[PDB]
Structures are given as C-alpha cells and as structure tokens.
Amino acid sequence: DRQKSSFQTRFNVHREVTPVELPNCNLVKGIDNGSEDLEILPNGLAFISSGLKKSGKILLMDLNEKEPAVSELEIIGNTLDISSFNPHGISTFIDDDNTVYLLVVNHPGSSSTVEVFKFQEEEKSLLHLKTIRHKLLPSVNDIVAVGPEHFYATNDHYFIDPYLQSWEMHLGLAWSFVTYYSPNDVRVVAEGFDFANGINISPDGKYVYIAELLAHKIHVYEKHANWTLTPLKVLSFDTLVDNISVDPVTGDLWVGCHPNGMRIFFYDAENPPGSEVLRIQDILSEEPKVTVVYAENGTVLQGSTVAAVYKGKLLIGTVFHKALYCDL
Ligand SMILES: [Br-]
Ligand SMILES: [Ca+2]
Ligand SMILES: [Ca+2]
Ligand SMILES: [Cl-]
Numbered sequence: 001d002r003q004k005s006s007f008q009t010r011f012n013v014h015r016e017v018t019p020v021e022l023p024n025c026n027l028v029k030g031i032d033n034g035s036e037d038l039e040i041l042p043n044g045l046a047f048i049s050s051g052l053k054k055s056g057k058i059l060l061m062d063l064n065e066k067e068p069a070v071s072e073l074e075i076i077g078n079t080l081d082i083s084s085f086n087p088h089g090i091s092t093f094i095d096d097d098n099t100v101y102l103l104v105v106n107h108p109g110s111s112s113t114v115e116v117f118k119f120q121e122e123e124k125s126l127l128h129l130k131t132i133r134h135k136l137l138p139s140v141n142d143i144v145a146v147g148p149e150h151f152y153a154t155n156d157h158y159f160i161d162p163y164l165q166s167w168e169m170h171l172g173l174a175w176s177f178v179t180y181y182s183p184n185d186v187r188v189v190a191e192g193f194d195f196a197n198g199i200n201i202s203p204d205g206k207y208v209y210i211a212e213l214l215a216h217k218i219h220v221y222e223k224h225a226n227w228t229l230t231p232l233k234v235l236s237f238d239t240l241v242d243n244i245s246v247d248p249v250t251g252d253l254w255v256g257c258h259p260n261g262m263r264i265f266f267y268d269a270e271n272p273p274g275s276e277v278l279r280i281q282d283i284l285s286e287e288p289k290v291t292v293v294y295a296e297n298g299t300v301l302q303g304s305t306v307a308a309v310y311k312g313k314l315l316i317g318t319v320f321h322k323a324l325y326c327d328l
Pocket of ligand 1: 017258259260263272273274275297
C-alpha cells in the first residue's frame, strides 16, 4: 500500500483554499444544475452547457447586458433525440460566412457522441445537424473545434463502461488519450494521460493546450499544418485543472480548477468542493506567469470547471452547481 500515497497526491487530498476575492460577484439567476462548460463568442454571446449527469440544456447569455439573464436555447431538427441529451464540454467554430457552429459533447447513457449544431441567432435556437461517434472517441470530455466537423477531443478514459472506467481510474492506468477527428481522417494524436480533460487552442492555431486533471498538468503541444501534435512544455500546479479557455486577444489561458480532488469526486454537502480560476500568461516564455484570479471554499460557488473573460467580466461555471459572474 503506496497506492495510498499515489491516491493522496492525485486527488490532492490535503489541499485547502486560500481565498482570493473579486469585487462584485453575482450568482447567475436560473443556473442551479451545472454549467460544466461555456464559451463566449467575440460578440459577447455566451453558450453554457448544463444538467450533465434537471434535463440537459444549452443556455445563452448576452454578456453585453449590464445584468445578463440566461435563456434556454431551443434545439430543433429531427436528427437528435433530446430526451437523452446530456451535454458536457462544448466548442464553437465561426465559418467564413459568419455561421456559428456549436459542437457539444453528449453522453446519451453511457456512451459519447459529439453533436454539431448551427446557432440561429435571430431565433435564439440551435439547428441540430449531425451526430458524430467513433471508436477513437470512447469517453469524450471536451473538444476544441477547428471546423464544422473537425476537432481535437480529450477522452478522459480508455473504457466506455462506467464500472471499468472506475477500475481504470483507481488502478492509475493513465490510458486516456487525445483524438483528432475530421470527415477524412481520424487518429490518436497524444496518449498516456491520467484523465485528460480540458483542451483548447492558441488564436493563431499553432498550439494546443491539454489539461490532465489527476496529474495537475497542462501540456502545450505545437500543432502542425498536417494536424499532428508534438510535445513542447508541461506546466505543473497544486490543483486539479479542468477546462481551459483561451482569450482570443492575448492568447492567455483561463482555467477552472478543483483544489481538492476528494471533494469533487466523493461529493458531500457537509464538505462541498470549492472553486479556483487560474490565469496563465506567456505560456511559451521560460517563466509563465500563473495567477490565482479567484478562489473560495464553496460557500458561494461549488466545483468550478471553467472560466472565461469578456470585456472586464469573469464568468465561472461548475460541474453540478451554479455559475458566478464577477468584475475583474
Ligand atoms: Br476544494
Ligand atoms: Ca470546451
Ligand atoms: Ca471538463
Ligand atoms: Cl468498455
């Protein structure tokens, strides 16, 4: 039993949270059942996925409003069964015509697909277009879109079956892996992760960032003209890193994190998980500037997974709880 010592470090079981406060944080009214991932367009519209397992939804906020309200986007089309819609990570892709595609990881039962929608702005609706599935996408956590049906995806596990996933995680196999998917060409691009989770890309398309939750790492890969990834750098932290957002103006990373892994994996309302947001600047330079921008123990926001910024505001989502909107 030094599978006790691996467990304590992986799940960061001793960590407590030094508070870092922001001025003027408000809970978003109407978000009570998760807001695991979100993405903000250049014009300030924000998509949020919720009700990850209280049915599954995609929410919309217009972050240009002074006190933004959430509305539920209506999904239309006949290619999607909503009664099992169970959305997880998301990504957007804006084509040359300014069509907005939204890609949504979906877990209908114990399975993964990637659902492609077209966002219809004037109507506040999502036109379902395509269900994607593949043997190289067994357990999809998050994707980053590089076209309407092109993305890199993390699998947080090698197995699909929850019983096996549980064994796979506790054994510490680290078999999780990252897939490039496109209509003509589906390949594994990186492998051997302990719970690969968030994933994103630099604004110029040359670097890919991947969060490895249980190793407390962000990997930086050079992304090449042929879509292949090569390892460049690994950053280490004292926290479980979950989803990565990238600010398109600076390239900075905004990361939602779980300080203590026991509290997010073995939920307990008497000891609920806290929240933490990191900002990472100059991730290529010799000393990347890492800053804790917001941190608390869960008396306001529990289980942060994602954070992004828009024009001076910070929006933070969680696995199964609320969302917080804050001034920086
Ligand atoms: Br915590
Ligand atoms: Ca995402
Ligand atoms: Ca995630
Ligand atoms: Cl399986």
